[PDB]
Amino acid sequence: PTPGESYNKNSPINIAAQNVYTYVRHMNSGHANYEQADLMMYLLAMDSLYIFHSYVRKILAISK
Amino acid sequence: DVAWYARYPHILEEATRLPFAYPIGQYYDTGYSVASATEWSKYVDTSLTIPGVMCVNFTPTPGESYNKNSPINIAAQNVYTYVRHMNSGHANYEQADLMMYLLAMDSLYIFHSYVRKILAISKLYTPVNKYFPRALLVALGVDPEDVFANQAQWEYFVNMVAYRAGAFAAPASMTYYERHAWMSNGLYVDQDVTRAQIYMFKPTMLWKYENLGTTGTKLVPLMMPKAGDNRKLVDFQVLFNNLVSTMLGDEDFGIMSGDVFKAFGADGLVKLLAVDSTTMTLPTYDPLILAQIHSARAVGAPILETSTLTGFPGRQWQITQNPDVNNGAIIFHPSFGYDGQDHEELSFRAMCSNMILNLPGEAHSAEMIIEATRLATMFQVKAVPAGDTSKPVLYLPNGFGTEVVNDYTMISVDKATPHDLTIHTFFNNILVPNAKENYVANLELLNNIIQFDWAPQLYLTYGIAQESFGPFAQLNDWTILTGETLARMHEVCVTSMFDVPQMG
Amino acid sequence: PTPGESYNKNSPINIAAQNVYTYVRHMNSGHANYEQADLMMYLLAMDSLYIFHSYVRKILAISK
């Protein structure tokens, strides 16, 4: 699983990090202790967790 | 009235059956009425070339700003106390950061309107105007054949500009954006006819954001393609890709855009028109914009960091904001009268008289007078040169609108073969040196200019006469306009453009 | 057979070349290994082919 190619801040996932950070920051008003990139790398680690769950769930569901 | 014509109507019918409505965009040879007159070669002008395109080359300005009491600093205070009182929290920016963001948004929107007009011109065809669409594409600076050959990539690029710049928020209640979109997304005829002549507005330069970190922010010029440059899609991609390079995945820009989105809702934002391979703009008749073209008043080329101005160091055009300079205010006082060289273009001396506000009819409403003077910019003093030696002469205005005119570009057809497009760039002021070839060339330019109806008023200086001649324009109900009156009108219109209806 | 007189881009043959290349290439998703002048030269060579056919079938039909 890739985030796409990213050479600088003008990349699609940095633009998506800006978009999802200004979405999340404007519902959770307060003193955030993280940036755009912390939130997007959290959202990318969530994908590896979900793919791992789908992987072991397919291991179980194949065996029947 | 004549009783003979009613007796022989077929004679009057067949004798006066002439082919009218000649298509413009072509060279026409009138021929000779005296067959022997070919012995008098250039003394008989058998040539006829009607122009089609006059492109007004503008620069978007915030108004004149010397201190914090300026209209855009007051507007920065107003929009900052509006945005700050809907987005309660810990803001990490000032008034001036937000207003320079709102000024960079305008250059993005004008760039999108520019490339969208490049696409929407390329589908224009009329069999009676041969200037459609290649002359309008040459006047915008693009290679016309590159837009026809690479149509789908041009459409993808324009849709991607509208999708990337459309991710940011800018308030639609600020009429700055609507005025610039009305100028930039517009093809305007001078007369409401079929073989009319076309006015366009094209940005000479755009304002490029650069964050100076601790030392503030800056808006630096980014020059656009001039007419006859044959620029390809890769050049406009490079222009867009350093226009939004500091902005497109940025933290602070996203925070300011989200704050503007929460303050002014989704219905109160500046919308970008998209293209769908059928988007076609049509030349409309708008006498409000023709009044501004008539009273338009060119200020010269923009001064850049690379420009050589002997005796004028540090005179480049920039919207600067330093917290250690002028109490942290947005500062913009550009120096005018520069034409791109170091030779004292002394046609600009003709702009030192007071202007004539020419305007049609007999009744002139307040909105008409305040709208017709928008591209008018009168010099007030000379700029003081730093040093005993000074090659150019620069000027300081008494204020200016949200746009200044830098140039005009005329597109006509060449009278020599082949009859390709001729590109002529001029100010309101035109120097005619003492040479044999440029007197009839100045006659060519003058007769080309008077084909356009509410054209800018010209000033013509001569080399050996050592004198300028005044407003070369057909007058109407006119008035003589002074610098303090135009300064008051400029103050009113810079205030009205940046006004946001507030809650506080 | 002539395509008309042509010395610049405002010729009727060049306007026709652009107008038919937009329809074949862009409006119908054609291939990108030729320009508009190649398409119009092809469209002009087809005319000489058809004029040859009309010529020899007139030779055929006259002889009876």
UniProtKB/Swiss-Prot annotation, chain B:
Instruction: Tell whether Protease is among the UniProt keywords.
Output: no
Q: Where is this site: Cleavage?
A: F20, A21
Please give the superkingdom of this protein's source: Viruses
For this protein, the record's Gene3D superfamilies field holds: 1.20.140.120
Q: One GO cellular component from the entry?
A: T=3 icosahedral viral capsid
Function field: The capsid protein self-assembles to form an icosahedral capsid with a T=2 symmetry made of 120 subunits.
Tell me more from the record: Picobirnavirus particles are capable of disrupting biological membranes in vitro.
Name recorded for this polypeptide: Capsid protein precursor
User: Organism source for this protein?
Assistant: Human picobirnavirus (strain Human/Thailand/Hy005102/-)
